[PDB]
Amino acid sequence: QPIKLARVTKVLGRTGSQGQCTQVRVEFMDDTSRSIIRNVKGPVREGDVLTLLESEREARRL
Amino acid sequence: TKKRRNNGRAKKGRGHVQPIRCTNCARCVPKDKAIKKFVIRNIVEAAAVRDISEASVFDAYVLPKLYVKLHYCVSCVIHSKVVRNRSREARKDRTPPPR
Amino acid sequence: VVDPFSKKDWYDVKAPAMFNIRNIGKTLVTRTQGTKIASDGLKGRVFEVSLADLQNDEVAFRKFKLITEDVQGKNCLTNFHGMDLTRDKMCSMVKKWQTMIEAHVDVKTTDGYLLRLFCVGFTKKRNNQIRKTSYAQHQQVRQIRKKMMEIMTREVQTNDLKEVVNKLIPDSIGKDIEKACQSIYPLHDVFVRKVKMLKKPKFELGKLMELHG
Amino acid sequence: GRVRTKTVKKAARVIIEKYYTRLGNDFHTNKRVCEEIAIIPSKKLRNKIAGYVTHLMKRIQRGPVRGISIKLQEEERERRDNYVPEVSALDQEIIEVDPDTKEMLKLLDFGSLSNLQVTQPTVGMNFKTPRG
Amino acid sequence: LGPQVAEGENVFGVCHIFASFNDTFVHVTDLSGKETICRVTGGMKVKADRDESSPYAAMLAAQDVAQRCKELGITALHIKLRATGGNRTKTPGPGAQSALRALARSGMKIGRIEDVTPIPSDSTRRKGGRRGRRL
Amino acid sequence: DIKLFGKWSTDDVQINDISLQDYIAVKEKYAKYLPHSAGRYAAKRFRKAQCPIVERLTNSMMMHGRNNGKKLMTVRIVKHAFEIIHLLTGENPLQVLVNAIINSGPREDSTRIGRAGTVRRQAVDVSPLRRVNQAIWLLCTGAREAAFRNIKTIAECLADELINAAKGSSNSYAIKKKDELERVAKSNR
RNA sequence: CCCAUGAACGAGGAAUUCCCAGUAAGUGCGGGUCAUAAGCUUGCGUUGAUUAAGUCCCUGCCCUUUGUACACACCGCCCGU
């Protein structure tokens, strides 16, 4: 469970029967830099920084 | 009136075509009328690839694939959104979607 | 009430001589209590094991069913029981604009083993072909199937089981069929798809030992 | 949204094509000149038109835009249209010619010409894309 | 009790993951398949019909299976997943993916991955009528 | 003479790293000698997040319909017993200050699934700011319930507020409720 | 308005209306009605903000295709002793 600092590249939008979860895409900084995606709750600004405390959480899309 | 020139099937120059069963309902639909998909997916979803690759005994194992032939009746294929109703002019198009 | 793994011994099952890897895994069996004998519970159990785990320089989509024949020194000695291909490999080969030709022969070796070999082959599209579908006509298919059966019989009826499996390990029969039938219709992926044994000669302990080196 | 309606778009376009000379880039100057040369009956609309003309000059300073036909850019473009190279591209000393076209030329009473180098035709008859 | 031979290598068993749409099975057995190490389904983990085939029940069963295999000596598994097969559906249920991922993530090593669902050379009539099922 | 407040100073509190200032950020005009900077924190999103941590903790406690937003309460509370404890301590509150809350904090929350079903929630995280502030809001509720129908009152928990404020270890209560929910939701990872 | 004679004295059947920042809500004040007649309404300030900067799930709308035996237009039409 490593704390990894990643940069937001693109924010998808909201999901739910009424809308309750927010999709973003994050690129790592020092882990053989690549891009993954993850869902997230609450305000996450334009191009802010995410903390991937775990390197395996993937969010299902649609 | 006649909605389609081929009657929505691929039967030309023969009388009877053996029927198959829709993969969802098991409806009897002629093999040429049925909507056929050929899914070639990874046995491991792209989300679960990393764990099984890390836990793999054999380096460079290349995980196998699931090959499935899916037959759909028109009702189930419409409901599953595999096909959609199209306009009178766009109905004639036979080109598969670009994807 | 009773833990059943405290009364279960672990045995090692061995591959015959033709395979580089000798130990393929381990097997559980209950201790010899009462009427039941551990040497009777281990005389017909089959291991479907990939060839790549048997030969360090072979393909992974070839599975071999190896059957234990006798247990001594708490080691089970296996023998060739069958050959087959993984389902994913077989499904990856059946494409939709080519002819699939299947053949099979029942044939006995020179040690009495009776094998039913199934070979499969697929019509190859030429490198400059513009035609979408490469279909062999029915007489071409018949000729290819006759050649398949002739080659399989020629390879099996003369060699004993040891040399038959030696040929099966690199699929020499498939390559021979592919080379032969090039003049009828170019085939693409020729394989002895399956080998199943119908009857076997009466057990010879010395035969199995000589089989292991 | 800040979408500029047809009124401000058309006014800015006509303003920029008619008096491109006076108009510039700094909003204060665009507003001043727009008031001076355009009878705009509002002040908010005047600021909107000046802002869009500023955007259009940011557009023109980095290439031509299809909406306007200013005299200077069109003059440069037509100047480019009378371009003529020193040596015509049809002044080829040697022209590579296949057997069939040289047969045509011989049947054309033009066979004495020595400019046409008869080439080796391609031996493959593969020219149609595969089907599927 | 268990094989403590060649500690630096792997001990291989096989898990038969029967991922039906009703529920999911995780069945680790001897390499020959004759002797069974441990079987956990999705139904003995959850008290609900709808969650029997859920990924949660499959993950719980896979974790329990991996724990039992670790304590019993087995270190690696060959995956043999399979759907209902027969004339019925050939698509593995929702529990296959989660169960396999949880086996990978629970201190186990994956060997060879195969699909062994039955595919008839042709079958009998399916449980529906000629008009299918209409709900 | 650029010392923050009258008793701290910014010339020595350094982390030699310019990326861990997500909680204490005193390097520019945003520094306050007294959090009563007035203003609004609901005009547009991310402007409640751009509140300083101190002012968010001191204000956000405004709830019920009678003490709703009356900034005089927040400023009087943060002045009272603060003026007292600064002289009566002598030592540094830094230890507890930091080491209860600002790494009591959880590391995930949960969100809705599919199109129906209210029997479990899928585990997601946030960039630690939103999670930490939701924990702070529930800790405000907890400080209420430790005052509301209880013994220890409001405007005497300045130790607990400093605990809620500063930087980096784990001792909380509402946050361990949040961590129990953490584990419950993470049972789906 | 003053004597403090004590009223489940600390978030509420089914069904639920209104509301996104000086929102809501708490308050009072001025007009319309009129005898300084308001508990209504129309405005005005003072105190003042927890939640969401989303989606089409419910209700409903719209720049498309599609089906119809409806056109009094789906609260239609219509079948059956």
From Swiss-Prot, chain A:
Subcellular location: Cytoplasm, Cytosol; Cytoplasm; Rough endoplasmic reticulum; Nucleus, Nucleolus
Gene3D superfamilies for this protein: Nucleic acid-binding proteins
UniProt GO MF annotations: RNA binding; structural constituent of ribosome
GO cellular component: cytoplasm; cytoplasmic side of rough endoplasmic reticulum membrane; cytosol; cytosolic small ribosomal subunit; extracellular exosome; nucleolus; nucleoplasm; ribosome
Modified residues (Phosphoserine): S35
SUPFAM superfamilies xref list: Nucleic acid-binding proteins (SSF50249)
InterPro entries: NA-bd_OB-fold, Ribosomal_eS28, Ribosomal_eS28_CS
Known disease link: Diamond-Blackfan anemia 15, with mandibulofacial dysostosis: A form of Diamond-Blackfan anemia, a congenital non-regenerative hypoplastic anemia that usually presents early in infancy. Diamond-Blackfan anemia is characterized by a moderate to severe macrocytic anemia, erythroblastopenia, and an increased risk of malignancy. 30 to 40% of Diamond-Blackfan anemia patients present with short stature and congenital anomalies, the most frequent being craniofacial (Pierre-Robin syndrome and cleft palate), thumb and urogenital anomalies.
Protein family per UniProt: Belongs to the eukaryotic ribosomal protein eS28 family.
Annotated protein name in UniProt: Small ribosomal subunit protein eS28
Organism: Homo sapiens
Record lineage: Eukaryota, Metazoa, Chordata, Craniata, Vertebrata
Gene from which this protein is expressed: RPS28
From Swiss-Prot, chain C:
Gene Ontology CC entries for this record: cytoplasm; cytosol; cytosolic ribosome; cytosolic small ribosomal subunit; endoplasmic reticulum; extracellular exosome; focal adhesion; nucleolus
UniProt GO MF annotations: mRNA 5'-UTR binding; RNA binding; structural constituent of ribosome
Keyword Repeat listed: no
BP GO terms, sorted: cell differentiation; cytoplasmic translation; negative regulation of apoptotic process; ribosomal small subunit biogenesis; translation; translational initiation
PTM summary: ADP-ribosylated at Tyr-135 by PARP1 in presence of HPF1.
Keywords carried by this UniProt record: Acetylation, ADP-ribosylation, Cytoplasm, Differentiation, Isopeptide bond, Nucleus, Phosphoprotein, Ribonucleoprotein, Ribosomal protein, Ubl conjugation
Recorded superkingdom: Eukaryota
ADP-ribosyltyrosine modification, residue list: Y135
Cellular localisation: Cytoplasm; Nucleus; Nucleus, Nucleolus
Modified residues (N6-acetyllysine): K14, K36
Crosslink site: Glycyl lysine isopeptide (Lys-Gly) (interchain with G-Cter in SUMO2): K14
Keyword Ligase in annotation: no
Transmembrane segments: none
Stated family: Belongs to the eukaryotic ribosomal protein eS1 family.
Listed name of the protein: Small ribosomal subunit protein eS1
Species assigned in the record: Homo sapiens
Gene that encodes the chain: RPS3A
Swiss-Prot record, chain D:
Signal sequence segment: none
Protein's GO biological process: cytoplasmic translation; erythrocyte homeostasis; ribosomal small subunit biogenesis; rRNA processing; translation; translational initiation
Highest taxon in the source lineage: Eukaryota
UniProt subcellular location: Cytoplasm; Nucleus, Nucleolus
Function: Component of the small ribosomal subunit. The ribosome is a large ribonucleoprotein complex responsible for the synthesis of proteins in the cell. Part of the small subunit (SSU) processome, first precursor of the small eukaryotic ribosomal subunit. During the assembly of the SSU processome in the nucleolus, many ribosome biogenesis factors, an RNA chaperone and ribosomal proteins associate with the nascent pre-rRNA and work in concert to generate RNA folding, modifications, rearrangements and cleavage as well as targeted degradation of pre-ribosomal RNA by the RNA exosome.
NCBIfam families membership: PRK01151.1 (NF002242)
Protein name: Small ribosomal subunit protein eS17
Annotated organism of origin: Homo sapiens
From Swiss-Prot, chain F:
Gene Ontology molecular-function annotations: mRNA binding; RNA binding; rRNA binding; structural constituent of ribosome
Subunit structure: Component of the small ribosomal subunit. Part of the small subunit (SSU) processome, composed of more than 70 proteins and the RNA chaperone small nucleolar RNA (snoRNA) U3.
SUPFAM superfamilies recorded: Ribosomal protein S7 (SSF47973)
Function: Component of the small ribosomal subunit. The ribosome is a large ribonucleoprotein complex responsible for the synthesis of proteins in the cell. Part of the small subunit (SSU) processome, first precursor of the small eukaryotic ribosomal subunit. During the assembly of the SSU processome in the nucleolus, many ribosome biogenesis factors, an RNA chaperone and ribosomal proteins associate with the nascent pre-rRNA and work in concert to generate RNA folding, modifications, rearrangements and cleavage as well as targeted degradation of pre-ribosomal RNA by the RNA exosome.
N6-acetyllysine PTM positions: K32
InterPro entries noted in UniProt: Ribosomal_uS7, Ribosomal_uS7_CS, Ribosomal_uS7_dom, Ribosomal_uS7_dom_sf, Ribosomal_uS7_euk/arc
GO cellular component: cytoplasm; cytosol; cytosolic ribosome; cytosolic small ribosomal subunit; extracellular exosome; focal adhesion; membrane; nucleolus
Pfam families attached to this UniProt entry: Ribosomal_S7
Organism: Homo sapiens
Residues with the Phosphoserine modification: S127
Gene3D superfamilies: Ribosomal protein S7 domain
Sequence position, cross-link Glycyl lysine isopeptide (Lys-Gly) (interchain with G-Cter in SUMO2): K32
Subcellular localization: Cytoplasm; Nucleus, Nucleolus
Keyword Nucleotide-binding: no
Protein's UniProt name: Small ribosomal subunit protein uS7
